[PDB]
Design a binder for this molecule. Structure first.
Ligand SMILES: [Mg+2]
Ligand SMILES: [Mg+2]
Ligand SMILES: [Mg+2]
Ligand SMILES: [Zn+2]
Lengths: 422, 387
DNA sequence: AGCGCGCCTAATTTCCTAATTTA
DNA sequence: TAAATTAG
RNA sequence: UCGUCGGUUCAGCGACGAUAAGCCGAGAAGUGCCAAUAAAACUGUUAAGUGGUUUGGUAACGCUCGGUAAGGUCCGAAAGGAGAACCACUGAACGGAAAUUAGGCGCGC
């Protein structure tokens, strides 16, 4: 398992912030240059090999023609002369991401199902495991030594050693960094991230650890039902316990955002003079800030929602979690009327349940809210979302979200519906 | 000048849909090959090629990138029409030339072209005719002479397109001669499995001339800062004071927080009213210029229950009056008595969020209802007629 | 007050190298 | 002696 | 009402800023515009027709980069001050980056 944590950079230990910013921006420009050029060299080789096969009947050998086993070696040999400021290790890692992206989707590129990747302006600076190192001083401060320059670059920038920075290691970041220093966690390739808001640089340390999973009974299954009145309702087949996420705070957020977003757009029709004449970024600045705010709110809401769901499973001893596969369903009449980011929520559940030893299975949500959880009679007549579920034969009434949650908690439930469609 | 508008293809007139679909897919495959190969040929022509291209294994006799690419691609994409093939190659080379300096610097990788790429149709290959029975037929020339012989198509391929409302207006002028076809494309959408043919037409725009018969009406309504309406046209424009409500709450917080500071706040609030008036006046005049209305009618000049509370109303009117003169428009002041209550549709004179006539039953925003009443050239006279 | 924009939002996949050798 | 290079 | 500082996100708190949904600078990669010039391609016996290319310049642009207010101690009459140097809370979370795709909108009227 691999996880990432962010650490804010405060000060360069031996340089000024103005000088540090100039170095970082220059290295970012080379990273963009390396990524685009590598895809150009990869795309060029793909065309040459296709042409070579037609004229000779066999694909050419990279070693014979290109001089290297893979295009990654050839890309390094060419981009190095121009991207001479980055460290060779970081440059090689940067090039590899471009070439692997092209190699992975090469078949889709030829078939026209995907475009050639093009890389934007602000790009993270790659760091290799051996290039990053972190130490704790006696006086309780954390110093990170970064290798970000090549020998020509170090000579021209007067730097003669690692460029040290101070990172705020606090809260849950202290435990992760303490385990990295001890040796339980192993640092993998990282990157340096810059955020436009607050103008802060970050150190994106990614680390490798071994999950500690307790033996949980695999016959216990918890069902997650994205309900109508309730954001998510959880139920278990063995025990009559129920949990729910009312999602009251979600409704309040969208009301303020919808009113704000509509108002901003209308003013754009008669905005100020300086609103235009300075590019696209300035003109759409008010909406970009609003769009970023919504993205951050969903990320936090999905983070706390996934944790609550997994924690409920752990308390009840469940070893299996079943949810609805949303690939087929496209009529979102659920509580998340603002088209919530369901995929981010489901991915967060998976990787947090995997860390706890629980296995996640995606059932097909068809007639799951219509079926009765007592007698199993499936009727489409009562599909009205009446906030209640009154079976005409079982005589069992319960919350519609709760009734759907029980059905998802039954093993092989979709097949049961599949065997007897109605 | 040039604008685009889709026209859904109903069915092929001469051949079956199964045959037409197979034919078009063959042409679509040649379109990608022409596009992708033209990018490779332009890459070598501009000197972007690496060493191993011209050293290991593998001037040119032509003058332009398009000329070099055309002949090389023509041998394989022999089903496409010669005229359309040139257009496909041209759009490939034009993008590369526009992006030539970006790729050399390293800001863009390589132009790419998707699978279901639209087919290019030049002028002289797409004609439209309207039959005596009202069916619109568009004849498309898509196959070259070798392709026509093999596929047993002995003339131009004809298809029927839908023309409803705005589509018929443009198409009728195309047939008349006011609008001339420039280029076209056959786009395919997988959402509905339908083929679309969009026509790019060139026309000489007509500049609206100010006439003293369209009179814009402005009402300082309760729900918005102003509402603009007209009788000749059904269009409407609104000035919502969203920024004004935020600024009022800003001023309220600052006064409590500050409890010179009052003087600076008063100076700030004075400038805000001036800046908003300038933006509002310019927008008000622009919508009259856009529709060519030669007169603006606004109620003659308290705070009342209007959305703007204790605003600099007189300053707003003067800047509207002044900016109207520069455009040739003239401003007339009208008595506002019972303007909100009078019904525009029926004229009878009688909840404030949406006005509903007792007799007519017309339901609409009261701000819009008042705005239409002011638009009448002789609204002032009929106001006292009911009295 | 319809039926074409361009494009935004959400969904989706991949990745998070090492071993050797100049300096 | 940490930066450079290339193979699988 | 929005925003800044208190390790990140979302909430409050203490202070503060706001015409900030505001005001500006430089530059020429791209789209329009102005001068000069008229290639590729196609229909063509021809005659000739469609088509709009190339080099400069300008700076209107949802052109491209950037600047601009905001915690407390401290100096400074105050403004202002060289990311000067110290100090700064409560709750719930804490796996991130890049690329791509395809649909439904909010404008469009
Ligand atoms: Mg649902
Ligand atoms: Mg906060
Ligand atoms: Mg905290
Ligand atoms: Zn039942």
């Amino acid at each position: 398992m691999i996880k990432v944590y962010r650490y804010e950079i405060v000060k360069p230990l031996d340089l000024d912030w103005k000088e540090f910013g100039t170095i970082l921006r220059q290295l970012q420009q080379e990273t963009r240059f390396a990524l685009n050029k590598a895809t150009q060299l990869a795309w060029e080789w793909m065309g040459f090999s296709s042409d070579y096969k037609d004229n000779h009947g066999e694909y050419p050998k990279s070693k014979d023609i290109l001089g290297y086993t893979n295009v990654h070696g050839y890309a390094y040999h060419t981009i190095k002369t121009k991207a001479y400021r980055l460290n060779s290790g970081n440059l090689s890692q940067t090039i590899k991401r471009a070439t692997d992206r092209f190699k992975a989707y090469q078949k889709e590129i030829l078939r026209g199902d995907m475009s050639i990747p093009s890389y934007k302006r602000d790009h993270p600076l790659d760091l290799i495991k051996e290039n990053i190192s972190v130490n704790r001083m006696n006086h309780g401060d954390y110093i990170a030594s970064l290798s970000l320059l090549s020998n020509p670059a170090k000579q021209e920038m007067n730097v003669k050693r690692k460029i040290s920075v101070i990172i705020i290691v606090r809260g849950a970041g202290k435990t992760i960094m303490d385990r990295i220093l001890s040796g339980e966690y192993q640092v993998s390739a990282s990157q340096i991230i810059h955020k436009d808001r607050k103008n802060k640089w970050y150190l994106n340390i990614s680390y490798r650890f071994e999950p500690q999973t307790r033996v949980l009974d695999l016959n216990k299954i918890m069902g997650i039902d994205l309900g109508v009145a309730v954001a998510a309702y959880m139920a278990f087949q063995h025990t009559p316990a129920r949990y729910k996420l009312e999602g009251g705070e979600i409704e309040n957020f969208r009301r303020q955002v919808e009113s704000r977003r509509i108002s901003m757009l209308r003013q754009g029709k008669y905005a100020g003079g300086a609103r235009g004449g300075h590019g696209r970024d300035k003109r759409i600045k008010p909406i970009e800030q609003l769009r970023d705010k919504i993205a951050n709110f969903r990320d936090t809401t999905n983070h706390r929602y996934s944790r609550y769901i997994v924690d409920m499973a752990i308390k009840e001893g469940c070893g299996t979690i079943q949810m609805e596969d949303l690939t087929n369903i496209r009529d979102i009449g659920s509580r998340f009327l603002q088209n919530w980011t369901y995929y981010d929520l489901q991915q967060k559940i998976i990787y947090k349940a995997e860390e706890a030893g629980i296995k996640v299975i995606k059932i097909d949500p068809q007639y799951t809210s219509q079926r009765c959880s007592e007698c199993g009679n499936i009727d489409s007549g009562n599909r009205i979302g009446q906030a209640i579920f009154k079976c005409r034969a079982c005589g069992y009434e319960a919350n519609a979200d709760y009734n759907a949650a029980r059905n998802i908690a039954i093993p092989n439930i979709d097949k049961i519906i599949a065997e007897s469609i109605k």
